[PDB]
Amino acid sequence: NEVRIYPVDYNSAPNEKPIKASDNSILIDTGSFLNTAITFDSFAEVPILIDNGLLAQSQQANKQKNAQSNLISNRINNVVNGNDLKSRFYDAVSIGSN
Amino acid sequence: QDELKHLVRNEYLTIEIYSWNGDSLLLDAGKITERTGVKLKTKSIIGYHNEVRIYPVDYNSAPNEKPIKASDNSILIDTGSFLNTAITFDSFAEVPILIDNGLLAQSQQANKQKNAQSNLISNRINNVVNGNDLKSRFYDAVSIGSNLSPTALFSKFNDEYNYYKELRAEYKDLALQPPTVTSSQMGNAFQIANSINGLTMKIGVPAPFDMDNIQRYYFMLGFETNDQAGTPFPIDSWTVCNYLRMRGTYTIDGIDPMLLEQLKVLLETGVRFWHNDGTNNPMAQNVFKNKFRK
Amino acid sequence: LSPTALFSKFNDEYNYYKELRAEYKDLALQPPTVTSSQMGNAFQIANSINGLTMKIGVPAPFDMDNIQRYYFMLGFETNDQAGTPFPIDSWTVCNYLR
Question: Are strands B40-45 and B51-56 parallel, antiparallel or unpaired?
Answer without folding.
Answer: antiparallel
